[PDB]
Write a protein that binds this ligand. Structure first.
Ligand SMILES: *[C@@H]1O[C@H](C)[C@@H](NC(C)=O)[C@H](O[C@H]2O[C@H](CO)[C@H](O)[C@H](O)[C@H]2O)[C@H]1NC(C)=O
Ligand SMILES: *[C@@H]1O[C@H](C)[C@@H](NC(C)=O)[C@H](O[C@H]2O[C@H](CO)[C@H](O)[C@H](O)[C@H]2O)[C@H]1NC(C)=O
Ligand SMILES: *[C@@H]1O[C@H](C)[C@@H](NC(C)=O)[C@H](O[C@H]2O[C@H](CO)[C@H](O)[C@H](O)[C@H]2O)[C@H]1NC(C)=O
Ligand SMILES: *[C@@H]1O[C@H](C)[C@@H](NC(C)=O)[C@H](O[C@H]2O[C@H](CO)[C@H](O)[C@H](O)[C@H]2O)[C@H]1NC(C)=O
Lengths: 156, 156, 103, 156
């Protein structure tokens, strides 16, 4: 008799295929989500640049002083980056992951804090007035798993 | 027999949870400690500005020419920034990390070196006279792990 | 700073090595750059209990080179010695990629 | 069997310790090399000042109108700054980095271009006549890796 040695194999054969794969396609997503964020990094100061030397958030790329077409600004897994009244929205590409990101959006949320500006990523938002921003709940919210933790920040 | 294959799992299960997490909450701390430092960067020249055009270190914010309330000047993980006779002290926020920083202080230490000023961060200090500064050992010393290495500089 | 840190406090880590520890590891000391790690007592039968491992760095045209294994200790910027103190965990135990003594 | 999971660790254990550390002690060097350059920035106009209102490059500090002792003019990682017939040489300190800079020199190279002066950093040089400058190859050449790229400019 050895079969229980075969049993235990077929217990090892049925693997978990750990959630540490899909929580880390969600954090592999955090990698290329970050690839969208690292794009946003450029616009942080450029959007800021318009905001400081013209006194309002730039509507759009042309005003921000970046590639007027957003799609030109893009990432290995990122589709485009649009300026939206200061709020920097980034759209993801299609396949490259299985994960529920494909074409989904990220936004980056600024706010003056006694001058000192405050950048929160995450849940898509959109600006309407100098400090007023709205939760831009359009169904392009990349899920909170995917997203950062420091930036898991909606419109406060 | 396979159990030693299960043994080795439960040896992998008991993970280290590397000190490269808490040495890098201490260097994640170095990130938002730097976020306090990047605030200080603004006051470097402004404090300097008072120091050069009035001939002594500014006591406080109002003299430095910055936000008279320190708390207004703040960071994502930073509470406030006070001018203290030139020495720029920065106080950290509460939670946002587990780490032993919460409400703790950093100081930035200036000194003329034949005109050329010398900025050392780190261990909290406080000025008393034009070049005399004291180790401001009040228990708000963020630990040296957290702190920089270039700026691991107390009052010499 | 241009030299290997003598010790933990300089390295910028837990000044007491013992604070830095593992489920089966006792402590971790910095020794002039060379990172020595001491194992705990029981938890295995095996001839590791209280034994040491070291990790061996070396600049290779800037690019640093990390070899684990046989306990070593640094004396100068690139000079390191085989720290043969009897705390050598046996080569069986050790890695194979890091089965590397002082070259 | 799991050992190949241990193998791959000890492949991760033997890390590269990327050349992006020593190419960035060479560009950390570019930071404090720049700290020497930022000193030179002051002398740019002051050396110029002598050059324009007396009609030749200042031999030395006293003529330039700066700290007569060069060592007084110094940086966190910089030893001294001497004027040498207009050419601003800067000497680095000892330890503070491992890197092959310790006590090494940088020079800054001026030249009139139809009035408009032309500042090139880098490979140590020394002036002999109003526009004649020599490659001051004394072994105090900080290596080109360390140095800038815009200023990787020897005597043309
Ligand atoms: C850039 O963003 C600022 C806020 C806009 N200005 C205003 C008052 O909303 C710019 O639009 C102005 O300039 C463009 C230039 O062709 C055009 O003349 C518009 O009529 C202006 O409002 C934005 N720039 C662009 C190119 O949209
Ligand atoms: C700013 O820092 C300088 C060093 C202070 N001057 C002296 C002589 O200590 C300023 O305080 C003076 O001006 C304020 C203005 O309301 C007040 O009149 C004080 O009596 C002066 O000493 C500092 N400025 C403030 C607003 O404290
Ligand atoms: C950390 O390691 C470096 C290499 C030491 N420096 C030298 C020149 O060996 C540090 O020791 C210096 O600083 C401590 C701070 O209290 C003390 O003042 C010593 O006299 C210095 O040599 C090492 N740091 C410590 C805390 O040992
Ligand atoms: C400053 O640099 C200029 C070019 C020198 N002048 C000449 C003609 O080379 C100055 O040296 C003159 O002034 C000093 C002042 O004590 C001294 O009298 C010399 O004999 C002059 O050549 C340079 N200044 C100094 C202080 O070397």
């Amino acid at each position: 008799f050895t079969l229980i040695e075969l049993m235990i194999v077929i217990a090892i054969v049925g693997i978990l295929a750990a959630v540490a794969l899909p929580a880390y396609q969600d954090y592999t997503a955090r990698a290329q989500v970050s690839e969208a964020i690292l794009l946003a990094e450029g616009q942080k100061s450029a959007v800021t640049e318009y905001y400081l030397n013209h006194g309002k958030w730039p509507e759009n790329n042309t005003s921000a002083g970046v590639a007027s077409s957003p799609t030109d600004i893009k990432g290995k897994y990122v589709k485009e980056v649009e300026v939206k009244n200061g709020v920097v929205t980034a759209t993801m590409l299609s396949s490259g992951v299985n994960n529920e990101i494909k074409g989904k959006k990220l936004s980056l949320w600024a706010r003056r804090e006694n001058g000192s500006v405050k950048w929160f990523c995450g849940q898509p938002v959109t600006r309407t007035d100098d400090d007023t921003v709205a939760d831009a709940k359009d169904g392009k919210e990349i899920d909170t798993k995917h997203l950062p933790s420091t930036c898991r920040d909606n419109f406060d």
